[PDB]
Structure 1
Amino acid sequence: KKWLGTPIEEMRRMPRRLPLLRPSANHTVTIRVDLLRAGEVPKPFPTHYKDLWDNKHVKMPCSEQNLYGSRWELIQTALLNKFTRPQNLKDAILKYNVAYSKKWDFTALIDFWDKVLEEAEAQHLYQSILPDMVKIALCLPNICTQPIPLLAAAMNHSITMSQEQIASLLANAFFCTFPRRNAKMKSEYSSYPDINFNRLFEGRSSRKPEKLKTLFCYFRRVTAAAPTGLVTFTRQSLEDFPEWERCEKPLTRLHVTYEGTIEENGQGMLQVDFANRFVGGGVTSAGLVQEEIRFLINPELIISRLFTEVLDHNECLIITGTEQYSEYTGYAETYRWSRSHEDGSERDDWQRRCTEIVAIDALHFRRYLDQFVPEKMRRELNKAYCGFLRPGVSSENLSAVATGNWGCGAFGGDARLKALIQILAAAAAERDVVYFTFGDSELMRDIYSMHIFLTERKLTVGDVYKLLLRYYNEECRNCSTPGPDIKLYPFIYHAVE
C-alpha cells in the first residue's frame, strides 16, 4: 500500500474564527486594517515614511542614517542605469558595496545571463524583469513606511505585512542594498542570517541557474501584478515544557506515506520546515534540500531572514500566508525549476493564504549515538513541541502536523527515532501527524507498525519516553562501537512484550 494508518481525508486542515487584526505590544501591523479588502492592494500604515535606526529594528536601506554621502542616493543612481550585459548589473551593485568588490563573486549571475539563457530570455531579463525589480526596490520608502522590529531571541512577537511590502524588501535583497548585513566578522547582526543575495551570484554550481530561475519567476510575477494578501511572521519562545516522563496523554492519529510532499499533500496542515537555526539555511548561498526548496518556491519565506534572530533551543518561527509561485522537480543536485505555479489556496479573514509553515531546527549530530543521549532527545522533543503548540487554541481547532524525516540526512538524525519524537511532541500538543517518508516504503511500514503497536497497548507519551531512556541506558550509554547492538524499534517491541 502507498499509505498506512488514518486516511488523510480524516485529518484536520485549515481553513475548515480570527479576531480583529490590530497592532499591539506583541503584534506589529504595517498596513491599514480598516481598508483591508479582498482583492485590493493593502495600503501601508503610516502614510508617510517613518525611520528607526537602532539595535531593535531593521536598518532600512532608505534611511537618512544609511551613510558612507547618502547611500540611498547612491543606490538610486547606480540602479537607474540601462542594463544590457551582466557586467552592468555587477558594477551597479558594487557601486554601493565598494568594500566587497574583491570579495563577492558574480560568476553564477554572469553565467546565468550569458550561458544559460537564450537570447530572447536574456533580453526579457534586462529589458523588463530587472528594471521592474529596480523600480519596486526603489519604491521602498513609500511601501515599507513603518519600522520593522527585529524578532530577537526570547521575543514572543508577530509581524503582519503585505505581500507587496515583502516584494519590495526582497527586491532590495536581490540588489544587496541592506546595510550592516555583509561583513563576515561583524558584531551587529552576527546572530542573524544573511539577507542580501550576493552569494546567490557566486560560483559555478548547476544549482544556481535553477535557484535563479525560481526567484526570477517570483519577481516576474509580483512586479507584473502586485499580490494583494498579507503574511504573518511569529517568533514563539516557550518556557513551560512537558515533564515528558510523567505525561499521561495518549498518542494521536497517524497517516504515513512514502508518496507525496509536505507542501502539496499537506495543504492546510501545519507544514514543517526542516530548518537551520539561521532560518532558511543556505537558500541564498549553496543549500538546496527541503528548507531551501520551500524558501525558493515560496520566496516570501526568505524575508524572515531580514528580521529573525538565530533560533534558541526553546524557539520556533511560524509563518502564515506565504504563496507558492513555482513548481519544481528533484532536490539537491537534481533540483529543477519546472514552471510558474498559480496558488489556489483560500485566504483567511486577514487575507492570508491558508498555508502555515513552522521552522524548527534539529540538532546536528557528529556521532550517530549522541542523539540518544537523554538531554538531546528531550531537546528535540521540546523543539518540536514548541513548533506544534498553539497556546490558547482548542485541540479540535488544530490542523494535523505535516512533516517527515526532520534532521535526517546531513544532520545525522535517525529517522525512526525522529519520527517517534515528533509523534510524542504532536501527542503532547494534541495534534495528529501526517508523515511523508519521501520514497522510503520500509520506513513507512516501520513507523506505522510502531505507532499501531503503541496505541493498541494504550501507552502514554510518558510510557514511550521512558522506553527511550531505557534504550539509551541499555544499548547506547556504554556502547564502544559507533552503532548499537540492537536497533530502537526492535528494543521497544521486546521491552513492552
Structure 2
Amino acid sequence: DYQFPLPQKNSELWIIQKKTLQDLSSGKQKLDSFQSLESILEILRDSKNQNDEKYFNLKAVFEQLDKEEQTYFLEQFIPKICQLVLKIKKKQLKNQIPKESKIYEAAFSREEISYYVSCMFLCILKDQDRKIYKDFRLIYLKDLVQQINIRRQEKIKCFYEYLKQALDFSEKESKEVVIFQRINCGQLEDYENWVDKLKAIKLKNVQLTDDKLIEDFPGTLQVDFANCDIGGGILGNGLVQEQIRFCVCPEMLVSLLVFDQSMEANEVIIMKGIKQYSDYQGYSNSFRFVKMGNSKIQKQKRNNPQTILAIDALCFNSSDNQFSEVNVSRELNKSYMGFKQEDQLKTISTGKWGCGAFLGVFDLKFAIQWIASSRSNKKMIICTFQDEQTTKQIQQVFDLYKQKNASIFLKLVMDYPNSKYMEDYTLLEYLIELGK
C-alpha cells in the first residue's frame, strides 16, 4: 500500500517545521505583515528561491479583507491553524486499493480533517520522492491568465471560510465522524448480461428540476461528476461540478490523501459526514464565493451532514461512439455500481453526468442513469441546469416509459443509431416518436 507522507515522516525537516509552527502558535513569533507570512510559508515548504509571485493569489484574498480581519488573519488565524498541524500524530496516510468486492474505508474525526486541510493551507503536503504535492501551492501561485487567478482566489476564499468555521467547532462537532470509502464493486457485467438482468425490472420515478442543483437535495445520495482521480483539478484550475462541490465542502479534500490511484471501472467512492461551509454563485470563470446566510435552510446546509457518491463518466471525444455496446455497458456498470451503494438512501440526486467537460450526450446519459436507478430500486432526481427544453423532452419520455420494462427500454435505445430516425431526431425525440 502506498503511504502518503505527512510532515513528520521527514524527521529532519520536521525539527525545523515544528519549531516554526510552535513559535507561531504560542505567539512567540508575531506576524506583522503579509510579507512575514510569506517568509514563514517559505520555511515550511523548504523553498530554495524567493519569488513573491508564489503567494500572489493568497495575497489577493488577504488584501480584500478589512484591516481588522487582516490583523485577525495574521495574529489569530495563522497561529491557530499552526496549532492544528501540531495536533497531528500520524506520520503518513494509507492509500489502499481494495481487493475484488472489498472496501477501503478511511475514517477521521471532523477536527482531524481540519488538521490535514490546515497542512494544505500551509503548503506542507508533498511527497518529495514522487515529486507530487497535495496542498495549495499552485492555487497560491500567479498564473499568466487573469481569470485563472480569480478562480484560484475564489477557491482560497472557500477554504479559508471552512478553516475559520473548523476553528470554532464545539467538542461535539469536532468528534463527529467523516468517512471516505473506496468500493470495489466486483465483476463488470457486459451488455448482454445487462439486457438479461433487466428483464423483470420496471423503470422507477424521476423528478425533474430546472432551477435547483444537486446539493439542494438533503437526505439523498448526491452525485459528484468525478474525474477518475478523485477531485480532478481541485488543487489547480478546475472549477466545474466536482471542484465546486469540493470548494463548498472542503472536508472532501482529504480524499486526495487516501485515494492516490485512479478509480478502476468497477470502483466507486462514497464520502459520508460531509457538511457545506460556503455558498457560491456562478460557474467556472464566473464562480465566486458567497458567505453562507443565516436562513433555516442555510443553517441546515452548514449543520446537517450528507453522503456523496463520486462516479467518473467516460471522457469522450467527438469520434467516439457513445452508443457502442462497450461504452453503454461501461456507463451502466459505473452508475449502477455507484447508485446501489447506501441502500437506505432511496433517492439519487444527479443530472448531466459526463455531459459537460466530458462531452457526453445527455439524452443517452439520462437513459443510462434511469436504467441504473431503476435496477437499484431507487428514485432519481434530475437537475437540468437551467435547460427548459431538456426538461420538457425528458418529462415526455418519463411520462411515456415510467413503469415500463427496463430491458426493452434499453433495447429501444440501442436501436436508435441504426434507425431511420438517427439523421433527423435526437435520442429523446426518437423515444417520443415511438409513441406517436
Residue 494 of structure 1: how far off its partner (Å): 3.9
Q: Gaps (5+ residues) in structure 1?
A: 1-54, 187-193, 348-352
The superposition leaves residues 117-166 of structure 1 with CA deviations (integer Å, 9 ceiling, x where unpaired) of 3323322211221111111112212xx59x64214265522122110010
* Equivalent position to 2:141, from 202, 223, 242: 202
1:310 correspondence with 2:310: no
- Which stretch of the first structure deviates more once superposed, 427-436 or 70-79? 70-79
Aligned to 2:156: 212
Q: Could you say if the C-alpha distance between residues 385 and 344 of structure 1 is closer, same or farther in structure 2, counting changes exceeding 3 Å? A: same
More helix by share: 2
Aligned to 2:17: 75
Q: One-letter code of the match for 1:245?
A: V
Aligned to 1:245: 195
Counting only pairs closer than 5 Å after superposition, residues 351-370 of structure 1 correspond to structure 2 as: 353-367=304-318, 369-370=320-321
* Equivalent position to 1:267, from 181, 201, 218: 218
Q: One-letter code of the match for 2:6?
A: M
Q: Secondary structure at the match of 1:320?
A: strand
* Equivalent position to 1:278, from 212, 225, 229: 229
Aligned to 1:330: 282
Distance 2:252 2:398 in 1: 33
Distance 1:161 1:373 in 2: 41
Distance 1:400 1:151 in 2: 29
Aligned to 2:55: 106
C-alpha contact 2:276 2:302 (8 A) present in aligned 1: no
Distance 2:166 2:135 in 1: 19
The superposition leaves residues 238-280 of structure 1 with CA deviations (integer Å, 9 ceiling, x where unpaired) of 124452222121111110010112112x110000011111111
Aligned to 1:463: 408
Distance 2:333 2:168 in 1: 43
Q: Could you say if the C-alpha distance between residues 241 and 294 of structure 1 is closer, same or farther in structure 2, counting changes exceeding 3 Å? A: same
Residue 425 of structure 1: how far off its partner (Å): 0.8
Residue 495 of structure 1: how far off its partner (Å): 4.8
Count residues with an aligned counterpart. 409
C-alpha contact 2:277 2:301 (8 A) present in aligned 1: no
Q: Could you say if the C-alpha distance between residues 258 and 181 of structure 1 is closer, same or farther in structure 2, counting changes exceeding 3 Å? A: farther
Q: TM-score by structure 1 length?
A: 0.76
Distance 2:59 2:418 in 1: 56
Q: One-letter code of the match for 2:221?
A: L
Q: One-letter code of the match for 2:3?
A: H
Residue 235 of structure 1: how far off its partner (Å): 0.9
Residue 373 of structure 1: how far off its partner (Å): 2.2
1:294 correspondence with 2:214: no
Q: One-letter code of the match for 2:85?
A: A
Q: Secondary structure at the match of 1:411?
A: coil
* Equivalent position to 1:448, from 375, 395, 411: 395
Residue 487 of structure 1: how far off its partner (Å): 1.5
Q: Could you say if the C-alpha distance between residues 77 and 340 of structure 1 is closer, same or farther in structure 2, counting changes exceeding 3 Å? A: farther
Q: Secondary structure at the match of 2:253?
A: helix
1:488 correspondence with 2:397: no
Aligned to 1:224: 168
Q: One-letter code of the match for 1:251?
A: L
Distance 1:163 1:56 in 2: 24
Distance 1:234 1:131 in 2: 32
- Which stretch of the first structure deviates more once superposed, 154-163 or 307-316? 154-163
Counting only pairs closer than 5 Å after superposition, residues 281-430 of structure 1 correspond to structure 2 as: 281-308=232-259, 309-340=261-292, 343-344=299-300, 353-367=304-318, 369-390=320-341, 393=343, 397-430=344-377
Distance 1:312 1:487 in 2: 31
Q: Secondary structure at the match of 2:341?
A: coil
Q: Could you say if the C-alpha distance between residues 111 and 241 of structure 1 is closer, same or farther in structure 2, counting changes exceeding 3 Å? A: same
Aligned to 1:439: 386
1:61 correspondence with 2:13: no
Q: One-letter code of the match for 2:385?
A: F
Q: One-letter code of the match for 1:377?
A: V
Distance 2:369 2:236 in 1: 29
The superposition leaves residues 440-462 of structure 1 with CA deviations (integer Å, 9 ceiling, x where unpaired) of 11111111211221126x2x222
Q: Could you say if the C-alpha distance between residues 99 and 216 of structure 1 is closer, same or farther in structure 2, counting changes exceeding 3 Å? A: closer
Q: Secondary structure at the match of 1:140?
A: coil
Distance 1:303 1:379 in 2: 28
Distance 1:346 1:463 in 2: 43
* Equivalent position to 2:183, from 226, 233, 236: 236
Residue 169 of structure 1: how far off its partner (Å): 1.1
Distance 1:304 1:275 in 2: 12
Distance 1:123 1:83 in 2: 9
Distance 2:302 2:157 in 1: 26
Aligned to 2:209: 257
Residue 83 of structure 1: how far off its partner (Å): 2.9
**CA RMSD for the aligned pairs?**
2.7
C-alpha contact 1:368 1:412 (8 A) present in aligned 2: no
C-alpha contact 2:205 2:402 (8 A) present in aligned 1: no
- Which stretch of the first structure deviates more once superposed, 336-345 or 433-442? 336-345
Q: Secondary structure at the match of 2:75?
A: helix
Q: Could you say if the C-alpha distance between residues 346 and 365 of structure 1 is closer, same or farther in structure 2, counting changes exceeding 3 Å? A: closer
1:150 correspondence with 2:78: no
Q: Secondary structure at the match of 1:356?
A: strand
Q: One-letter code of the match for 2:282?
A: G
C-alpha contact 2:272 2:308 (8 A) present in aligned 1: yes
Counting only pairs closer than 5 Å after superposition, residues 63-142 of structure 1 correspond to structure 2 as: 63=9, 66-67=10-11, 70-79=12-21, 80=24, 81-98=29-46, 101=49, 105-114=54-63, 116-141=64-89
Distance 2:129 2:75 in 1: 29
Q: One-letter code of the match for 1:222?
A: A
C-alpha contact 1:258 1:440 (8 A) present in aligned 2: yes
Q: One-letter code of the match for 2:247?
A: L
Q: Secondary structure at the match of 2:54?
A: coil
Q: Could you say if the C-alpha distance between residues 422 and 368 of structure 1 is closer, same or farther in structure 2, counting changes exceeding 3 Å? A: farther
The superposition leaves residues 388-438 of structure 1 with CA deviations (integer Å, 9 ceiling, x where unpaired) of 1138x4xxx442000111111221111221111111111111110011112
C-alpha contact 1:373 1:472 (8 A) present in aligned 2: no
1:174 correspondence with 2:121: yes
C-alpha contact 1:268 1:355 (8 A) present in aligned 2: yes
Q: Gaps (5+ residues) in structure 2?
A: none
